[PDB]
């Protein structure tokens, strides 16, 4: 009896860098994804294990709404099965993964003349994340045998990298805006419903 | 010193196998993205295949299927194992630490020369 | 992504200005473009990386620029230890994409 706040997952005004990415619970509530297909603004719109229409008329424990910034040419890492820097040290979609991924070009939003410094993701990483993992230490990155403590140097390396976003970028590096729609099917009550 | 240092390089028939090998010495292999790039007698550099930190790899499309790399981390050391050679694949091979936008490939090995021909 | 660098070889003499300058084809973030220097036999050595940034240990002669789709690189007094191939190279993708490389010469 009441609209899920989609709009304010994909309408916001500040995206989350990939790195530190937002997540939205949504619950008890009344979702149409019909909507959001039939926006048709959306670059990317890809849906697994479910479909946009049949998935209207489904019902779930819960649902998430990730969201944060990638480049262009990384939006394909946000896919069940991919690697890379992305996938493996920003955000792991699971093998098995239900849900929707959506992503748009927001070079008129996130990217700036003199570049944005605003968005960065995660270059060094000892191990992949597992899915749905987020990593937030900004730990000086040893990549040698001798230990860095927290001052930068040879073999010592800030783990984060910006992406510098600016609008005369080739289109491979923008900024675009992604929300992952995952679909958690708990032995529980259901809340959210087309 | 900081060193990369290959071997295992030689004469061998097309269609044959080859491993070569690049022992690290003040870098950790496992903690670095670690590159082989090419060079092909009067060329330039060729890109061959990359190890990330976190085990993903990748390769040039005229490869795949047929190099694999792989890496020791109990002996700090970087390998390329090639499958089904050819004569193309006649080049000086190097390891290389890569920074990325950190900064570039700023540990290279000396190279090892790999000759395809029957 | 292409990387063209022109001129394919330049003639210079000592205490020169020289540069080598790389287009690349769409536009890409300053902190991806790397110079190299390669002598004959020898591997290649790192100069500059971020499009700017001095490599510690290389010479202070050695200078980077550029953004967009036009990179340079500038030796401000050549020096003989200086005539070799240059490469420009696009980071962090796979695979990384190499300019065509400049050859810098002895003129007479």
């Known amino acids: 009896t009441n609209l899920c706040p989609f709009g304010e997952v994909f309408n916001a005004t500040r995206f989350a860098s990939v790195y530190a990415w937002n997540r939205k619970r949504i619950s008890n509530c009344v979702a149409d994804y019909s909507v959001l297909y039939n926006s048709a603004s959306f670059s990317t719109f890809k849906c697994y294990g479910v479909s946009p229409t049949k998935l209207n008329d489904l019902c779930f424990t819960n649902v998430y709404a990730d969201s944060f910034v990638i480049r262009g040419d990384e939006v394909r890492q946000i896919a069940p099965g991919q690697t890379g820097n992305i996938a493996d040290y920003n955000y792991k979609l699971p093998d098995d993964f239900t849900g929707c991924v959506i992503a748009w070009n927001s070079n008129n939003l996130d990217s700036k003349v003199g570049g944005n410094y605003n968005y960065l993701y995660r270059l060094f990483r000892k191990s992949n994340l597992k899915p749905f993992e987020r990593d937030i230490s900004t730990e000086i990155y040893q990549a040698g045998s001798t230990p860095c403590n927290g001052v930068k140097g040879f073999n010592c390396y800030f783990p984060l990298q910006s992406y510098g976003f600016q609008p005369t970028y080739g289109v491979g590096y923008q900024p675009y805006r992604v929300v992952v729609l995952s679909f958690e099917l708990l032995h529980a009550p259901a809340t959210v419903c087309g | 010193e900081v060193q990369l240092v290959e071997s295992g390089g030689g004469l061998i028939q097309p269609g044959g196998s080859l491993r070569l090998s690049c022992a690290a010495s003040?870098?950790?292999?496992?903690?670095?993205?670690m590159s082989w790039v090419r060079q092909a007698p009067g060329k330039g550099l060729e890109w061959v295949s990359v190890?990330?930190?976190?085990?993903?790899?990748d390769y040039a499309d005229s490869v795949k299927g047929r190099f694999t790399i792989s890496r020791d981390k109990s002996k700090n050391t970087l390998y390329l194992q090639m499958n089904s050679l050819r004569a193309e694949d006649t080049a000086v091979y190097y390891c290389?630490?890569?920074?990325?936008?950190?900064?570039?490939?700023?540990?290279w090995g000396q190279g090892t020369t790999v000759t395809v021909s029957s | 992504i292409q990387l063209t660098q022109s001129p394919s070889s330049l003639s210079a003499s000592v205490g020169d200005r020289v540069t080598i300058t790389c287009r690349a084809s769409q536009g890409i973030p300053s902190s991806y473009l790397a110079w190299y220097q390669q002598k004959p036999g020898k591997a290649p050595k790192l100069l500059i990386y971020?499009?700017?940034t001095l490599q510690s240990g290389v010479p202070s002669r050695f200078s980077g620029s550029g953004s967009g789709t036009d990179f340079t690189l500038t030796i401000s007094s050549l020096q003989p230890e200086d005539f070799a191939t240059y490469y420009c190279?696009?980071?962090?993708?796979?695979?990384?994409?190499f300019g065509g490389g400049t050859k810098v010469e002895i003129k007479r």
């Open positions: 190890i990330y930190p976190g085990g993903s790899t």
């Open positions: 971020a499009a700017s």
């Open positions: 003040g870098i950790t292999v496992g903690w670095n993205y």
């Open positions: 190279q696009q980071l962090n993708s796979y695979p990384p994409a």
């Open positions: 290389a630490r890569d920074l990325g936008e950190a900064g570039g490939m700023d540990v």
